[PDB]
Amino acid sequence: NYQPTPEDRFTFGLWTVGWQGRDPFGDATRRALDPVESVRRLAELGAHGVTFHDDDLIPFGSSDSEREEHVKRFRQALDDTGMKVPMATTNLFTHPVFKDGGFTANDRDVRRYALRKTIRNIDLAVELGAETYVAWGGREGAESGGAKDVRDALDRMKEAFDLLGEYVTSQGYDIRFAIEPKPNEPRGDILLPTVGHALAFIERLERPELYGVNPEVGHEQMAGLNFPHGIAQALWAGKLFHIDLNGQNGIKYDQDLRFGAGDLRAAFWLVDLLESAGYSGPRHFDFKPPRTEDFDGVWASAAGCMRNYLILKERAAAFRADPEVQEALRASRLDELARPTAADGLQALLDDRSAFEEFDVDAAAARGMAFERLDQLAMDHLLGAR
Template sequence: MTKQTADKFSFGMWTVGWQARDPFGEATRAALDPMHIVDKLAEIGAWGVTFHDDDLVPFGSSASERDAIVAKFKQRLAATGICVPMITTNLFSHPVFKDGGFTSNNRDVRRYALRKVLRNIELAADLGARTFVLWGGREGAEYDHAKDVRAALDRYAEAMNTLTSFVVERKYDIRFAIEPKPNEPRGDILLPTIGHAIAFIERLEHSHLVGLNPEVGHEQMAGLNFTSGIAQAMWQGKLFHIDLNGQRGIKYDQDLVFGHGDLINAFSLVDLLEFGGVSGAPAYDGPRHFDYKPSRTEDTDGVWFSAAANMRM
């Protein structure tokens, strides 16, 4: 398939690389090497690849191992023409983050989370990524009395102020995009919707550097109209990045192929993004990023067929 450069189609390594392990079943596919993912994305016509730090460099790798992996990754990017428009950090998988990263009740964990993100910002700058997404999947609780929400928001804001001050001091051309989600894996997650996140951002020191990375399924899990939410994010100048996938109503996060859920809302979203600007010009010029998961029933070939289906939508 010809590369769709103008469309800026990008995929997370964790999407096509998902081994189809879920809370009730083991993996149904083998792990994919990150370098192979880059090659295959180029083959199906994608423009960019994104990743969490641990997607590329396994957690606990030594400095020399990390350097070798990053060097090899850069070679694959150069060979394929694939770019890295966005990077994010995994602050949810390791048991140390069981109570969150930036909002953990444990001060040592909060400090470690900041160090992990700051190190990854350096990699983002090195690779030319201009957007840094922050999804606080563990920033929340299951019980109302387990975490002081006001204190947690203070800690969240302190972390964001530290990160934005860091990029300002280093003169990096990087902006941050908060990804809202109402629940899962936590019972309740802080900054659950576009509206919550926008209100939070307005209280930050460098709020011009912080916007949103809304995801179709996350807003629809809360019963909200995704197109309307995106329109408001645009109106407030806060749509820094977007995650496209499919969701069929208020249930667990399905991460279906884009359009394989609420088809009418998907059409209205595309119309807004592509023709909602002045005189019918695109209203959004950032990456069209697909954060989906191939079905557990797919084999390896099916992974790439489903990835291409997102771009055809």
């Protein structure tokens, strides 16, 4: 029942199931996982692929010989399991050298080192077959107002992404970039805090068609925002290159709960949106098994990520296929929302007396929207009450 298959495009970061359980007030509760182990267990659970930071796969400071050995180890695990590597990313946040950021660090030499660290992992990602390269600028920001001129930081961020886009085109690489927004933590405020801010920044890049967003469920909910609404605007702009699925209980620290947890109804409306729009990218889970769990609970949490998506997918499909729902959507004039407001043109609208001079404003105002019956129908479908 609700069994994931590799064709479901479910992917996991090595840092997700491999999280040793270390939070700001406690030490690790689980031993480190061999990346080869994680690929094997995730393949057994029905996952389609894995993703990685450079430091997840190759320990920081490894020589060129150990690096090659670590990649050959990893490559063999992908060959033996049939697991893909659809996206890769850079760790520009863990080492103390990135404490003021990577691409927008105040120190110029740290910025230049951040670009070199990203570039050689882009080579590795392409060699592993990744189609998307994600950038989470978790250290780009500030705790105080004077520590960062945001206009200058935005110049340095545009410079870095323009240089990366110049690298991939000059190399012929078939890879696109996905900015992952986050409003805060670990910095007090992070640059490009939401999906909207990231989408606007992309329009100022040299080659905007190379860049999209990788939104995370919990990150937009850390700002109290409606995540399905943000995804819809990302899809509307044609910039949903990638997605991060997890759960979050409102505005607080980044929980990274398994998908389906947190705001359950928002997860239902997101799956309904992703499936109706025909999203064909990876279903990526950027989550953390709670440090209360042993390794059996780690794999149970990862399986719950995939199970919860499949249950919600079934409930959303039954919701849209219901003739009572389809009739209710017409009763709320969802069909009129899709119709153009003034396809007849500006001049016709200006001479249309039925639009103003002879508009019965009270008859229109008295028309109920019937949203509550429609929403209860969605609730019945989500809960399996019909």
